[PDB]
């Protein structure tokens, strides 16, 4: 009910370089009255509970199906790649009032299901960008799961 997001993951082991390309979102929830949504994507690199790095896409105006093709790279040393989370949040930009979250997902070793599958496919295919769709989840539910270590 919140929408779907597609992004690719690439890890370059010898470089300790993690690249997330936000490709496209679709079926996004409508978050404006007298408009659609104005989605941008924020990416947080976290280590369980702690914020490490953040990046964000441009804003696409008045659409529930944004296309980005924007690449985001993070330094994650080989020894640390199974300790981090890449958190992807889609938000509706508003000039007036809160920028409300449409939904979010995270990938990493402590993710589950299709999110863990994507992460494992990345690690299993070093230097190759692996693209996968993800269902967006309620922000507060994903936030709770960020604390669950494996």
């Amino acid at each position: 009910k919140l929408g779907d997001i597609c992004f690719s993951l690439r890890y370059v082991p010898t470089a300790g370089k993690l690249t997330v390309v936000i490709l496209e979102a679709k079926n996004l929830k409508k978050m404006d009255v007298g408009g659609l949504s104005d989605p941008y994507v924020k990416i947080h690199l976290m280590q369980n509970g702690k914020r490490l790095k953040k990046k964000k896409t441009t804003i696409k105006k008045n659409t529930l199906n944004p296309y980005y093709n924007e690449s985001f790279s993070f330094e994650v040393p080989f020894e640390q790649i199974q300790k981090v989370q890449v958190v992807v949040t889609v938000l509706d930009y508003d000039k007036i009032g809160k920028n409300d979250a449409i939904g979010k997902v995270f990938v990493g070793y402590n993710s589950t299901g299709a999110e863990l599958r994507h992460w494992s496919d990345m690690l299993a295919n070093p230097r190759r960008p692996i693209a996968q769709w993800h269902t967006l989840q309620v922000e507060e539910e994903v936030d709770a799961m960020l604390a669950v270590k494996k």
């Binding site: 690249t19 953040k54 990046k55 964000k56 896409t57 441009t58 924007e70 690449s71 985001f72």
Partner: peptide, 10 residues
């Protein structure tokens, strides 16, 4: 607080 970086440029 840090200004949020945008997409890769290279």
């Amino acid at each position: 607080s840090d200004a949020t970086e945008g997409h890769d440029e290279d």
